[PDB]
């Protein structure tokens, strides 16, 4: 009987949990559903997305994620033609209405998201309803759990402390093929500068006597790592997976991208010859991003 | 939505700290990354919880002090909250409220002994209660129903699991955050995904030997399981030979912060590979999002 959990929230209104309209995830009905939009929508984590038409506050329809099933980007179908196809309801709620009412509203007409409205009597003539955000069940549950019995543990945030031409080719390859080096994150100028930096361009001397010298290992499996490596010239032996599948890789095969976005690889890379490579630590990546966001503005 | 047992989380999946644990730098970083306001402290075995550690008590500890958790816990002495598995949700909510504890440790009988099942947090109970009685009709899937007119228009499981793990751990677009391990494995098990290519030895440059042609649109990802290929990179045409576990066309699946490669891949042998179209990726994203978690 959740009627008990309903007795300790009758003093809270929507204002407490309201997420303001400016901070709400929405879609302009005129959006075109290409791969980018579809991927970003399906990854946003929302199953229910409002759709407005002109101003951000003129919500008209609602998009369920399943509405997008069987939708091909090639068709470049607009979101309007998907929402004007289905007939999903818009659940409304008032600025001042209590939370038990909001919950029995989510129940009646199954939903987890309601358009919070407030009346505007300031003005001669008839009044109007001014949308001022959304109320989502996540926030209501959070408020109930925080205000039923509160713990003074708001301390979450406790903090505890090679040929220049081939390098240009590498810059172009990375900008066009690897995402973390996309021009949107690191300008092509800054990336070119990074790849030609001495602390990035590295070489390895292969002691043939100690054929398995510790310095021949660019990556060691299940061992913390902090850098990205692309092989410019030479050959390496890669041992992949728990099984230890051994392959031989050469130039233009990059490793450890997840180290820039702890991270421990799923493989071990060892040097088989004299190597020319480019190593990029996470800190170097952060400084490149900072420089790029300073350059843009 | 009946008893504690139905919503608790098991000892296996819980985060705790040993009582003799030194509070070095690593433990502090680990806890702060876990983001848990409560950490149990077991005496000898995890099944035996002896103390409770509130995050409030652990904020201002100096990593350089290398204090032992014993000092913190014994200084704050936070009482414990036990409970059985048969107790309903309303009873445990009243227990949490009248008591001053945010979580309890559940006890069932494996008979004769009281085995600790796990920890029930108030978050879990409130979640279950004010979630199980309000559904969202957008999380159910009735898309089998055809609403618009219908137009009339394999290999070793061991290395396959290895491929799934490799992609999940190394390539981002296949990260578990985007495609669940189940859905990714299911995708790798598929005729149009697991593909082979036959190398016409007479016409070494057959149009079908070209998986990617530089500056020519493509819309799919390829990882090489078996065979050899020639990669011609850049306007310069740097030619290299690549083999197994060298993936291509990742940018066709990523969404930035209309894809043409910076290279041309040609087949040199009979190829066994994994092909992933943009539509296949989008349907994988939906499929993973169908499973609530």
UniProtKB/Swiss-Prot annotation, chain B:
Compartments (UniProt record): Cell membrane
Domain CBS: start-end pairs: 8-69, 76-137
Organism superkingdom: Eukaryota
Expression sites (tissue/organ): Widely expressed. Expressed at higher level in heart and spleen.
Role noted for this protein: Probable metal transporter.
Miscellaneous comment text of the record: Shares weak sequence similarity with the cyclin family, hence its name. However, it has no cyclin-like function in vivo.
Family: Belongs to the ACDP family.
The protein's name: Metal transporter CNNM3
Organism: Homo sapiens
Record lineage: Eukaryota, Metazoa, Chordata, Craniata, Vertebrata
Gene name per UniProt: CNNM3
Residues represented out of the complete protein: 311 to 658 of 707
């Amino acid at each position: 009987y959740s009627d008990l959990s309903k007795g300790v929230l009758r003093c809270r209104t929507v204002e407490d949990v309201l997420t303001p309209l400016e901070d709400c995830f929405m879609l302009d009905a005129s959006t075109v559903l290409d791969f980018g939009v579809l991927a970003s929508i399906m990854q946003s984590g929302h199953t229910r997305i409002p759709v407005y038409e002109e101003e951000r506050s003129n919500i008209v329809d609602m998009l369920y994620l399943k509405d997008l099933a069987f939708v091909d980007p090639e068709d470049c179908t607009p979101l309007s033609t998907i929402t004007r196809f289905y007939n999903h309801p818009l659940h409304f709620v008032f600025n001042d209405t209590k939370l038990d009412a909001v919950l029995e509203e989510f129940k009646r007409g199954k939903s987890h998201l309601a358009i919070v409205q407030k009346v505007n009597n300031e003005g001669e003539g008839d009044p109007f309803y001014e949308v001022l955000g959304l109320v989502t069940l996540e926030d209501v549950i959070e408020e109930i759990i925080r205000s039923e019995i509160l713990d003074e543990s708001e301390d979450y945030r406790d903090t505890v402390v090679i040929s220049p031409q081939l390098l240009l080719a590498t810059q172009r390859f990375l900008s066009r093929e690897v995402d973390v080096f996309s021009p949107l994150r690191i300008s092509e100028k800054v990336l070119l500068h990074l790849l030609k930096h001495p602390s990035v361009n590295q070489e390895v001397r292969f002691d043939e006597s100690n054929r398995l010298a510790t310095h021949h290992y660019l990556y060691q499996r299940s061992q913390p790592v902090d850098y990205f490596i692309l092989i410019l010239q030479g050959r390496v032996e890669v041992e992949i997976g728990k099984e230890g599948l051994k392959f031989e890789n050469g130039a233009f095969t990059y490793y450890g991208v997840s180290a820039l976005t702890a991270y421990c690889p799923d493989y071990t890379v060892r040097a088989l010859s004299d190597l020319q490579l480019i190593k990029v630590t996470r800190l170097q990546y952060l400084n490149a991003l900072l420089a790029t966001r300073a350059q843009n503005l």
